[PDB]
Design an enzyme around this catalytic site. Sequence first.
Site, PDB file in Angstrom:
ATOM      1  N   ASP A  48       0.855  -1.183   0.000  1.00 42.54           N
ATOM      2  CA  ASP A  48       0.000   0.000   0.000  1.00 42.54           C
ATOM      3  C   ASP A  48       0.888   1.229   0.000  1.00 42.54           C
ATOM      4  O   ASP A  48       2.010   1.180   0.508  1.00 42.54           O
ATOM      5  CB  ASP A  48      -0.946   0.044   1.203  1.00 42.54           C
ATOM      6  CG  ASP A  48      -1.832   1.283   1.196  1.00 42.54           C
ATOM      7  OD1 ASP A  48      -2.704   1.397   0.307  1.00 42.54           O
ATOM      8  OD2 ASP A  48      -1.638   2.160   2.061  1.00 42.54           O
ATOM      9  N   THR A  81      -3.744   5.659  -1.788  1.00 42.66           N
ATOM     10  CA  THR A  81      -2.378   5.726  -1.309  1.00 42.66           C
ATOM     11  C   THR A  81      -1.510   4.751  -2.065  1.00 42.66           C
ATOM     12  O   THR A  81      -0.391   5.099  -2.457  1.00 42.66           O
ATOM     13  CB  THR A  81      -2.322   5.391   0.181  1.00 42.66           C
ATOM     14  OG1 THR A  81      -2.799   4.055   0.386  1.00 42.66           O
ATOM     15  CG2 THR A  81      -3.197   6.346   0.956  1.00 42.66           C
ATOM     16  N   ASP A 382      -8.677  -2.711   3.605  1.00 46.25           N
ATOM     17  CA  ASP A 382      -8.806  -1.411   2.961  1.00 46.25           C
ATOM     18  C   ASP A 382      -9.825  -1.422   1.835  1.00 46.25           C
ATOM     19  O   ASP A 382     -10.509  -0.414   1.627  1.00 46.25           O
ATOM     20  CB  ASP A 382      -7.456  -0.936   2.424  1.00 46.25           C
ATOM     21  CG  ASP A 382      -6.500  -0.563   3.527  1.00 46.25           C
ATOM     22  OD1 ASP A 382      -6.968  -0.387   4.669  1.00 46.25           O
ATOM     23  OD2 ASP A 382      -5.288  -0.442   3.254  1.00 46.25           O
TER      24      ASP A 382
END
Lengths: 514, 510, 509
Positions: A48, A81, A382
């Site tokens: 990530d 991100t 996420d």
Amino acid sequence: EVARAQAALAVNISAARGLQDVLRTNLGPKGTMKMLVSGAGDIKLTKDGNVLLHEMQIQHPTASLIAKVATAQDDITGDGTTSNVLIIGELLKQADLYISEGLHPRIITEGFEAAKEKALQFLEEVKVSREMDRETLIDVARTSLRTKVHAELADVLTEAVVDSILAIKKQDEPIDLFMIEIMEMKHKSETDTSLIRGLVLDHGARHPDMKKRVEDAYILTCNVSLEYEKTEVNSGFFYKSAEEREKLVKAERKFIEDRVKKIIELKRKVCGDSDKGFVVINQKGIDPFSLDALSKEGIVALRRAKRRNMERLTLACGGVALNSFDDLSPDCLGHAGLVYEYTLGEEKFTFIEKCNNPRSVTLLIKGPNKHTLTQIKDAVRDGLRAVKNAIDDGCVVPGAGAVEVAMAEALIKHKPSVKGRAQLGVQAFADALLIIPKVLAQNSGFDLQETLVKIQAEHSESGQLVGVDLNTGEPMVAAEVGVWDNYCVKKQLLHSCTVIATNILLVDEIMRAG
Amino acid sequence: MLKEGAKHFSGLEEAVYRNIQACKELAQTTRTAYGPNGMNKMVINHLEKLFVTNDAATILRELEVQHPAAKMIVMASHMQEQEVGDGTNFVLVFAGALLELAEELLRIGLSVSEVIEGYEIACRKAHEILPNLVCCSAKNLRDIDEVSSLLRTSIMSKQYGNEVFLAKLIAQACVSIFPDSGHFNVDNIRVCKILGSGISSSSVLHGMVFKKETEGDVTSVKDAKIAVYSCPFDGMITETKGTVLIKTAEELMNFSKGEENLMDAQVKAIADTGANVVVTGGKVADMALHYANKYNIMLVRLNSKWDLRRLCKTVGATALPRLTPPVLEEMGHCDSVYLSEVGDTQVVVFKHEKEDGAISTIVLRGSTDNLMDDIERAVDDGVNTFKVLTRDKRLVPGGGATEIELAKQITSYGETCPGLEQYAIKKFAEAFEAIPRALAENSGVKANEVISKLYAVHQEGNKNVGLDIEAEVPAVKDMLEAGILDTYLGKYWAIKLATNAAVTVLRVDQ
Amino acid sequence: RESGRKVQSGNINAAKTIADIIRTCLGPKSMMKMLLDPMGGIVMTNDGNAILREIQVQHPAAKSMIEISRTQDEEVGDGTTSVIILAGEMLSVAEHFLEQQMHPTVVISAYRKALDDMISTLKKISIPVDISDSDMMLNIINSSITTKAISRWSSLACNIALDAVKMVQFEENGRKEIDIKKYARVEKIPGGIIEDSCVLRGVMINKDVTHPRMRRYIKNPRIVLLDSSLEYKKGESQTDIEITREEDFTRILQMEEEYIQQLCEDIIQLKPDVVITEKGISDLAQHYLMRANITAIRRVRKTDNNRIARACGARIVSRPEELREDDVGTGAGLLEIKKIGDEYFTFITDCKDPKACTILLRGASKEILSEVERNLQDAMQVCRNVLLDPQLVPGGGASEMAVAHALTEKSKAMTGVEQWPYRAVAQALEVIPRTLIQNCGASTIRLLTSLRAKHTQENCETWGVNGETGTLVDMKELGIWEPLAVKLQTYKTAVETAVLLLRIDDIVS
């Protein structure tokens, strides 16, 4: 130590690329995994953007500063991100080119904003309002998990995802701090991803065979001491008073066989049979002989619970909490239509499942129990927030750069100001957008140029949102493909990309001192 | 990086170049460590203990690498060995070989996912024709030669010489004694080396083999209530005094006298707690022992934690220090508890053997443990190479014959598939010759000779190599037809597990 | 130990870079410098006062620059960057030349005449205000808040600044000088909203009095500030021996009663309920008052009582005898324990003197309030700066380009070697315009020469370049404004500042 202006901006912009570049597949299924053995000095696996940042001890302020604001999106979306860093330095690439030719650092920073708007306006313009169904969320689930893991791995994951949020969409809560209950399990393979609409109980009772299958779950989540303790304990404890210890020996198991009977009667009140399952869960230790009395009554009486689990027990079941079992109505304890007390490995992990009115939904994964088993847990989680945004926004647009060109197009296709001045900013601004597909397409395949002129002309020809085949390098209608941007996600990181890129363009010295 | 920043020890050269080489050197070690070989690899412990093994994990465990590249994968061979016996020595080298084809593809400039999947694709294709490679299955797990045919392989896959009687004695150890129906026990089957006699003299005593001295009179009864104690007698006396001997003198004569009947007390309370044998992780106490000789409690003067472990393990025992009259918690399990002499040493024996609680404990005689250890290495695997827990193991050619079978197959498909996918799928079926090259060395020939014929033998599921002169010129053995076979199972695993990392380990540039 | 020209260099040397990097940080349009700690701690600020700090400081005149900076940080806190610009401007230009022309001296003098010409021009270039019209003031505050780019809550706090600070303004030397700030009292409050706050009369007592037995509300009892000396006298007027025994407990505690009452009856002579007891606090003092059912608020600050001295507008009374409303609790007045959030707040309102309010602040919570308060703090001070100075100037280059002409016109007319400072003085005005030209990000030499002409006919009275409008402009229409003094206050400093280091040729340890 100091570097001024131009020399200040270099260290900024120069630090971005290589840092930025590592992520050139962090997004979509093409995203390449990255292993820290070095982050704290420990073997790990991650993809990530923000997470990898914090994971590595990251020495450079450039690396340091965005992770703070990159924390925002990963807080919000959890991904992108995995994306945003890429436009940011490419944007940094753009502005210098002026100042490289020369131009005032202000006006370029200045020219990003109406650009930051007219493009954000295009977001309003491009955003595809979608009516979320599990399938739509399935492809929303897999677009974030492709970003994370195999689309293969996205598959068994996708189910629990769109299904867990499925019962929170019932709750009409657009965000999930519940049904975020996740479980990991001893396995040879992290492949297993399990979905418990209820909970899963870590602790087993020190007594096995109590009620091993609790069908009707009547759960009193109990702080109660059914272990007060059995022998000499004074307040429940040892002390310096014999005089008190002399008085305090007997009432112990009395206060216990109380709570024994308080369960005994409770069980038979809750049940009158061992047929209907029954559960007692202590936040603390229980006497096994209490259990022995109780384990033979049809209860599974459980001990040393974690106050967190008590909640989702108290809530997803609609469970309850007392210090005295007394008797309570059978219904007075929260319920799960089935409870399955489950040992994989040596520990029984009890599934209190379809907990009545679940606000929580438990996602088990069985695995090798490595950071592999971690790389799956983070992966879904996420996407959970991502797919949660699709609950939030009714507008979800496709990813794979289907957005970028058409967005980068207009403000480039026309100076949005018809200022060179803004277009200075804008041409700098509106350009960096393309970084994502153009590298991914070339990450997976042919030079960006074709797909670019494809996707542009395509969008120009279509206006349909067409996006890379993220392991090919060819544009495909990304809406139908299913690689999908929450109007939440993309819009934010857009802002995030630019909002940082300005004052950091504005660092005209840095002194090492403090 | 260019900056001061972040954390990585892989990437750039490392990912492409150095990880692959970190993915190389140890596979390079494992190449003649697997399969029929005369290769031998000396190792010293943290004990500085000189030992030789062609087993990896032994070597592996003491190997540290700054990269995860070499580091992370070895779990798979363990993840493998978690499942089975050897083939583990094959696991990594399979990866490392097929790996470094990709850095070539990296020289050729092939994308990761482009490099990644064709293997994975063909990894199925392996597993897909892998059953087509079942040339037999396991008939009688009770039969010796049914089983010995196999067991010879992992031993062979470890080492060439000793495989036969091993494969015999291990089924003569009666892997038979379990259904292995899903019920099989290597806690009930233990390899206990007597240092002494020969290894051809090595026996298998069904029932727990404890070479530890059977102390005093044997068990009270053979269904032994067992008191397993870390320190059951630490001594009952404290001599601290004016002189810590005598100052007021008669105060001495109390405790040295009053100590021993407390050891009697404890020992009587061993008879009182009911233990038909008491077990001392700590020392024996002679008077106590004498009392335990009076009470005829079998004893063990000293007990390894390993002892105590299996003791605590299988008995249901709990090893405890006791300065008190003891308490049975440990109780019994084993329904016959004996004394044996194998290599002529007192063998504390525990046998309940139920076919389920069934204890067949391999008792290795030999005049060297390092001997009986590198032995036990292959012996470690054979039993759990035998341990598939499919009574029908779908026996597939041993020794690596199946390799070349799919070398043709899947690269012929690798041919058929198009794109950059090709070499991905094509390099895949090229990953076999590594060991046919590796053992061809210790065999004494080049692999072209091997592989051209291993190709020219074409589809066999027999014809193969190893350490042999058959492995030299002919590029033909019977790695099926001779009695050297393999379970279908570890194949799937030795195939799959390595394919995963080789894919995965490259993708991480960090 | 440091010397002369090298000091003079180190003057120009350090004061150069001292004057500099925060001008990138200057302007509503700005450039924030990054600041790295040796540990790696990173900082992004437009604040020189902040920027002054993490940077490792050695040059002791740079320390002295930090001084007039902090000295100005004491005064305004804004323009501390801008004050050190011009001294940096000043010290740079004339010094080396005119010291290589041999003098601090003519340099020293002419800044007297650099000062006054603008001081003159200031009264010309700054225009009076309605402090009467808070909107006429508000636009300033609307302007004051936004250079550091804070509007959201401040837009209200803008008004609330106007409100109290005109009231918290009552001060006279007889020339009626108003600095009075401490009258203004601010409140950290949980809950409410940043868009809901106010100014309540007297001085609201927030900080250290939550005290629940103040009662709650005082309708018209007095609040009592004690520089008494309420301390029980164990004897008649005196404190007798301690109590080590039963006999000392009966006799002494009895006489301890009288002195409390006779003063607390003198306190009762002004008829309170609330008595906030500061000097002479006694465990019997509140207890008597609590027996008097007079809530006696102890364990308290005289700072509160100074807040309360400004809460009733009163003083605090050392007089034991005959305590009065006008002595303490001047005016009818109120006292009220209020819960804004749930925090108990004493509100003592209705000072005997009008212009009585103190700023209540509510955010959605303390923090987002502190967002208001910090910016209101700037907002509120600009008031008493506009309340200080009822003249105000079109800003930017208009402020800058105005005097240099007269200054050069002087230098041309004065035609001494003092003319040379007035030349050295002339363009030092234009550096923040350069920064303004930085702020717009444009070509300075043009805009200067362009704005130079803008003072050739327009006389740049309202005409500067405003980098935030980007262009040479009327600053009145554009509305760039500050109360005159602030301009001078920034302007006065750098003169003396430069003139300060203009004195130093010698550092010595």
